[PDB]
């Protein structure tokens, strides 16, 4: 006619954000280098924009995660220019790629992190970044594919 009681004990644990960079395989396409256009140090190229999505996580934890970019620099003076990483006949000379902020401020590659200011889109949290080829004196008709590393400090 009567019974007792049953209790349930468990834990709900937060999960770190899953980071997706642009297209599949964390690859963002860029336009071909123009030999005529890339002549002087200030010569630039078309600005191809990509976005990084921090999905499968809460917006609160996503917005508090510091963001930084790092890698290798082609020259000591060109701190904000990624060094192209290609060892073949398609390697270009005296060129690089630059990662750029929304407004147009170059991003340092040392590793100095900052806030993420994630835009809470309808889908998830997103952060847009910019990429453009940067000339440093000369241009060579070659595939100047480079590599950069993305650092997220989950505070």
């Amino acid at each position: 006619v009567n019974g007792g009681t049953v209790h349930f004990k468990g834990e709900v644990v937060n999960a770190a954000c899953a980071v997706d960079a642009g297209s599949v395989d964390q690859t963002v396409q860029l336009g071909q280098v123009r030999t005529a256009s890339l002549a002087q140090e200030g010569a630039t190229s078309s600005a191809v924009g990509f976005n990084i999505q921090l999905n499968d996580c809460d917006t609160n934890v996503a917005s508090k995660a510091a963001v930084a970019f790092l890698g290798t620099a082609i020259d000591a003076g060109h701190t904000n220019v990624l060094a192209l990483q290609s060892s073949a006949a398609g390697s270009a000379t005296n060129v690089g790629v630059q990662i750029l902020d929304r407004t147009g401020a170059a991003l340092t590659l040392d590793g100095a992190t900052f806030s993420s200011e994630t835009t809470l889109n309808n889908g998830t949290n997103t952060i847009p970044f910019q990429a453009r080829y940067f000339a440093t004196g000369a241009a060579t008709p070659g595939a100047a594919n480079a590599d950069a590393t993305f650092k997220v400090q989950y505070q």
């Binding site: 009567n2 009681t5 209790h7 309808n122 889908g123």
Partner: protein, 680 residues
Amino acid sequence: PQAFMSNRARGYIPPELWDPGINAGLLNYNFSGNSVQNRIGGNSHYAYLNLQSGLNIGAWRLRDNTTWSYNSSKNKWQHINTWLERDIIPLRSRLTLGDGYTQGDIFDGINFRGAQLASDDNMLPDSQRGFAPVIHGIARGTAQVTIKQNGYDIYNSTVPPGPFTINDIYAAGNSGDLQVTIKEADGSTQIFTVPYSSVPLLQREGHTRYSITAGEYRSGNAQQEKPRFFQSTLLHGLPAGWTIYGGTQLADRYRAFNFGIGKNMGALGALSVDMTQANSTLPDDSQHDGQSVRFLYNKSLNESGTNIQLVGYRYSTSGYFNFADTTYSRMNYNKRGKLQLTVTQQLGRTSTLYLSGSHQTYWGTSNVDEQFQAGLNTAFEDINWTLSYSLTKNAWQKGRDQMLALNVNIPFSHWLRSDSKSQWRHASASYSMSHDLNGRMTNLAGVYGTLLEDNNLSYSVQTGYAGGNSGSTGYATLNYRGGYGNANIGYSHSDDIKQLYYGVSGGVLAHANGVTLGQPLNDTVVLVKAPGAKDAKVENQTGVRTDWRGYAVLPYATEYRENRVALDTNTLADNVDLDNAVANVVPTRGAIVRAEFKARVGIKLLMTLTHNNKPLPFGAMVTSESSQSSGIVADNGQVYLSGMPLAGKVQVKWGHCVANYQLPPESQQQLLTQLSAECR
């Protein structure tokens, strides 16, 4: 557009990935024994053994149930139920030959013995289960839709410039308000809201459920006969929040047809009205024709998320009988009207008043069955207290039959610190106080909890006082859930009665790789197989560890779902390293799926390899055929290997090294060893 595109629901698993299982036997045993000693009549022994045999071959699952009873004076094996179940994927249904039960909600519950074929809602993805409105829309231009609840967003997705139907909305409780907001890059936002209230008889838009049962009728009572009957049930979800549902019951003497509709009116609530017309033959030769109309109403959230009301009425005219009334013996007062009124009111974010009122009137006998219940549960911090009151005035002069109860549960963590190392943190104090409103008093105070590292051994010691008689009763139980079975020991001491309970439950699988013992099984099971890894505890489960062969069986696994089987690497032998510590299986109903794990048994090695006084390049593959081990060079020529002999050689294929190495017994005894070895 989205509507034309064959978009899949959230959490959708293709039927190809569903694992039928393995060809294996099965045997679940549950032995219980009670030694009862009283001063009046000495001592006595009772023993009950429940044995559920089973065999899963192909997709068919045969299950048989037997019971053995022994009193201290003879052995009596008694069959109960046998059934050969199976699931049919093209029909999205489940078939069962042999015994079983009728899950009919439009009709009354019936135990039968024959062929049943019923659509199962568990194979559907969890998104499109229950009742939830589907959204149809036309979006001018590419749009972004954010179907959002009153609290937060639910479904955010992109939609092409065309028709779109969204059916992935979760149940979101009984009642809800969905605001569909479409935003286009060109025009302004367009918003429209829809409320919904659900009833169990309602179905999603375009959802069909069916059940076809045929065979003889079975019941526990020996008075009733065993007539053959057929029962068909259909539930369909019409467009625009309607539901059409019917049914037919047929036998030699009883023919009933049920027809009903249901509506989701939105803010008003939800409705379900049905009528059942039955022509029956009583135990004698008399024939009776009758009807019964059932009505169900579910109100939305009154006030602001405070009150919820349910009203269930049922009027049965003179001449309507269920199937049992017909199938009574060859020679052996109907319900004029039954009303149920349920009101739930939540206040203070803690207290929840539940009021239930049942009112039944019969034919001829104007006696009224009234049942009024009022519960109040409150969870104030750790303390949880419940006060209940009940009243029952029945037709056969049951009187007031009032009752009052008060249960308070106080965990010891209310006083112990957050990071206390004592076992008292896994305990609580329970106090129950019951009045019968006539002086009959029952008090019971006790403690309970767990005191093992895996929280397997659960203890519960409770004393109590019953007062008019004045009886003091003790009740102490220990239940251990180990890797080979569950053992419970109980002791109930009274004024002159001493009861000692002892029971063991377990399961045995006669799979291909020998016999595996484990905890009692629950339908679907997962056979974790990690040979060479003895005494490895699996995660998210209590007291489920591999035996000396590395084989264990999980008690319960969710059917047609993505469930994770993980081995706790912390409580594993330092000599064994798992190549994969987490596996994923998708079991079918009543199936045994093998979550195979690979475990290397040798020592754990960290080798720094250099070629021509230069570290090996990044990404190079290092393999050892002496014990079948592999690894990838991390950096500075550092490579990790698992399952390696004390003396041996490895080979590196950067794009053909050979490297000899030897280790001391201290290194083999150490947890992880580090060494350096040059290439050739």
